[PDB]
Amino acid sequence: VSVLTMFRYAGWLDRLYMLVGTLAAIIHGVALPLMMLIFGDMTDSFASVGNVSKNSTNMSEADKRAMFAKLEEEMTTYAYYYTGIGAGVLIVAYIQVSFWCLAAGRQIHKIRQKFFHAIMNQEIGWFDVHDVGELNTRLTDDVSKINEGIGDKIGMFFQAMATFFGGFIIGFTRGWKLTLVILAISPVLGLSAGIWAKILSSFTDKELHAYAKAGAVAEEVLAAIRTVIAFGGQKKELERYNNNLEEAKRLGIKKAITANISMGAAFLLIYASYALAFWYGTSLVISKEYSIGQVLTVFFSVLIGAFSVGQASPNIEAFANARGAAYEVFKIIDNKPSIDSFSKSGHKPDNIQGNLEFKNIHFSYPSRKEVQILKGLNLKVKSGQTVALVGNSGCGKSTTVQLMQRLYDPLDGMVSIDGQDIRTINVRYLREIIGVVSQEPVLFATTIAENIRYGREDVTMDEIEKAVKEANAYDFIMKLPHQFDTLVGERGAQLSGGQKQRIAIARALVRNPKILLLDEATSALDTESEAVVQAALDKAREGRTTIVIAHRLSTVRNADVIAGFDGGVIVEQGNHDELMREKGIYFKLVMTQTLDEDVPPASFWRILKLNSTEWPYFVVGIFCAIINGGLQPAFSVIFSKVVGVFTNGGPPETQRQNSNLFSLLFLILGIISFITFFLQGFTFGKAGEILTKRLRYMVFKSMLRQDVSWFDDPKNTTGALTTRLANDAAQVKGATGSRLAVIFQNIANLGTGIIISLIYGWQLTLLLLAIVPIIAIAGVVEMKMLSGQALKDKKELEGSGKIATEAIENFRTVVSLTREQKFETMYAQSLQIPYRNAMKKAHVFGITFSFTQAMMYFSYAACFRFGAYLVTQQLMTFENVLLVFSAIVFGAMAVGQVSSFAPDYAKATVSASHIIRIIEKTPEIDSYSTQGLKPNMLEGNVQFSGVVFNYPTRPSIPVLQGLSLEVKKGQTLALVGSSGCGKSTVVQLLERFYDPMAGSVFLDGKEIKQLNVQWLRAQLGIVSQEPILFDCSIAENIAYGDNSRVVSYEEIVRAAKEANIHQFIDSLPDKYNTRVGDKGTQLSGGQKQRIAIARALVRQPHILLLDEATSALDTESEKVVQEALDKAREGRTCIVIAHRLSTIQNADLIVVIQNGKVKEHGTHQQLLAQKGIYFSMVSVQA
């Protein structure tokens, strides 16, 4: 595979830098065990000096002089080891970053410019395959990955290995026993982590299967939310959603449980291996002699080396992902896959004029989603003629024009322009002679001068002047401030669409074509702009060959030959009259034309407020983070005391202390950490669990208690709500997991470290905080400079992609052809600034990482440097020195955890905000109870007075304006409107989905405003235009149970008997108690609409609301439903809406509502005697 070789087109200096980066990376990684190699020689001599001090007990005069002089003489050489490596890691750092920038910069910039060229030079192919807009997003997002993949990540890979494999060499040579053991634990640790990954993967899918069910309930309810309201089953659908929530939590705790075993047992396996390494290391000294203390510290480096392999792995995956995404479309980048269509190199005779002769053309759909869409074609058009084409479709004329170009090639036939065919003619030349006036209005981001200037870059203002005057575009340019030089921002804002087309026409006048293909250039226009544009088209011909497609019979009257087509194959030819005489296509046309979510305020710890309210105890948990925090240094303290008694003293007692301490290194760490780790796991697990319940519960009830623009907006979509229930509840589990974790690292460095610092001699304390806050600050401040270059980089690429998205959204740019290379020139400069900036961040990023390694050696140097010196003369001990080194590594793990928890606090605050805004509510439907609860408080006499309505979307124009009606008890109020949508809205405002803005509605004198929600659906029944079932048994479907409804077998039988759906139910096994499949996808509309009626009469309505109860039905399906309605009705008030008149032919009071305004109203036979609006509608049925 070739992912940098051929990929970089084997660039000379690209290959050059690639070896230089590897070489500098080896020698960076080797150095790291080489520093610790130094720590071991320095450990040896000091022990040996100290050994001699303890064995004397008489000398301590001469020993105070010379032995310590020697340690100071070695210390100066040591200093130069640490410095020498220090200078080395600096230089070589800068080297590894150049790879990250300098190499990649000239490359991506090269890949991009040839890529952008290869799309225009392959013409059609790129446009065919996938979808532009979405296509150019992923690609500009992909080009940044390439930089990451050929960036220093490879260099970090080689570095990682140089520390592993290169370390292990020196470990292994200089002694083979401790190595053997250190390799022996490598598969045990790898076996365990492989069970881990299997547990993770398995339990995730299980959780998902649970939460799918909860999602599946959430999907249908929220989509169906108005419907679920209408039957009053809010509280029920809620109760089912709680069952699914019950399952998703029991799988929740087991996942948290098993995870806590993995994480616990993992630190156990670390501490075990670590103790076993040290123990076998000691048994070879005391009773034997195998280590002086040099190799022991180096074997510790072989343990650092394996941890490097684990850090390497993300670069490997970062590369895997860089490669795989680029390399698939790299195949498409290299070569032209269409060599059929090309923009470049041909040859023309230089033809003056062109007579089009089309001989035997047959061609298929360009996307091959239909085969053969032209059955033949013989067309001979000479110059001086105007041929008009007409059809049965608009598509087959567009096809001939697309073929006419070199955009597609005709499978059979050839179009001969002059003597030349369509492949002995040059592409560049083909375009210049071919004018196109298309229907879509030209888009541009720039001034009117530049827009002519894309036409030819050789155009003089004199030619600009004659152009616009002849295209009658010379009006608007004067009107606009700044004349021709007026900016048009966006993609049109200054100019209107008709004016856009005029400019394009003026643009073609500078081309001087001798072919014009006019595709609806005088259609889909106002009467005024048709006449203007027509004139321009008339003056642009002076004897040109043209082919005109229009839907205007006047322009097809001036064509010399009009040609009939069946939608792709020619049938008729001759003048206008000959066709009209045949009664052809031309004549056919003649007769045909005769809330606010993602606002700025954000959460300020409302997370822990909302969390704590629903928490009662678990204070032992919080306490456990503190003692498990402080548990971490002790492992190091014990370790310090180990090597301390291991160095000094003779053979008697040393074995016993090492054994004693070994058992202690186990019991204090391994045994306790597992216990306490699992207490903290029990706490943030059960917290994140019970939060998942309350949060999802208290949302879903709030969703039923609120209405209007919390799901009636296209950014509050149903899916978007379900997605919220997912992400927020998943997230809070990680939110609670981060708190105890932060307390753990707080005490772990700061807290205990101070306590450890007090038993120091406090020169060491001083020396230590000249390191720790600074190494921390170098790591946080690195991240602040990093992200600053990253922001500006994203910003740069915005402007470069933005002028790119203009070209690619236009397929029609290849038609000019000229402006392909002109655009890429403008790209080259636009892309030149981020290139130069890439060179700027090489030095900056170079220096940052350089200082970062500069602080590592500077730390170790000054640690041991100042750690000895004055101190050795007086009193100095092995202890406190590894505890300093431990405190150093504490400064690292702090930063690492904190930058990690920086986006957790973010995504949590956002989710905590979503949950707050929902609860704030807008409540027109909530729950209520205000009504008297008497069936004497209704007549069924619904008054409507000055009632206005407009959708929750405000620029929709009210469709009820000044409406007042009345309908008395036991009369059907029909409604019919040949304009508007004033039909459905009446039924809706009465259902109170959306409260009328003004006017009032009374149902007898009791206003809509004060109606209890519950009582409202106990006097109302609805038959929707879409009936929808829930996945539940059929008996629960015929009548759904509320808490105030009794459903019984006998009742739903009677219900099915009236509903005439009992026919199908009888034939289904078990009658009413059956369930088949899922939802209502098994059962036809007709069966379902019967079930919706059957649901209604449960509530015992006195007012029936029929939303299309006689539409979406045909033949018998209509009749059988109507029978079910007719029996359903007991002399009840009804609102029957639809524009179909069928059951309006017995409607007691027929109302013609025009746009909120009633025209005629009244009995059928009276209205039928009128010759007005109602009757006219009746006449036009016949």
UniProtKB/Swiss-Prot annotation:
Its EC number is 7.6.2.2, 7.6.2.1. It catalyses: ATP + H2O + xenobioticSide 1 = ADP + phosphate + xenobioticSide 2; ATP + H2O + phospholipidSide 1 = ADP + phosphate + phospholipidSide 2; a 1,2-diacyl-sn-glycero-3-phosphoethanolamine(in) + ATP + H2O = a 1,2-diacyl-sn-glycero-3-phosphoethanolamine(out) + ADP + phosphate + H(+); a 1,2-diacyl-sn-glycero-3-phosphocholine(out) + ATP + H2O = a 1,2-diacyl-sn-glycero-3-phosphocholine(in) + ADP + phosphate + H(+). PROSITE patterns: ABC_TM1F, ABC_TRANSPORTER_1, ABC_TRANSPORTER_2. GO terms for cellular component: apical plasma membrane; brush border membrane; cytoplasm; intercellular canaliculus; plasma membrane. The chain crosses the membrane at residues 12-34, 81-101, 151-172, 180-200, 259-280, 295-316, 619-639, 664-684, 740-760, 762-781, 842-864, 881-902. It is found in: Cell membrane; Apical cell membrane; Cytoplasm. In mouse the MDR gene family includes three or more related but distinct cellular genes. This is ATP-dependent translocase ABCB1.
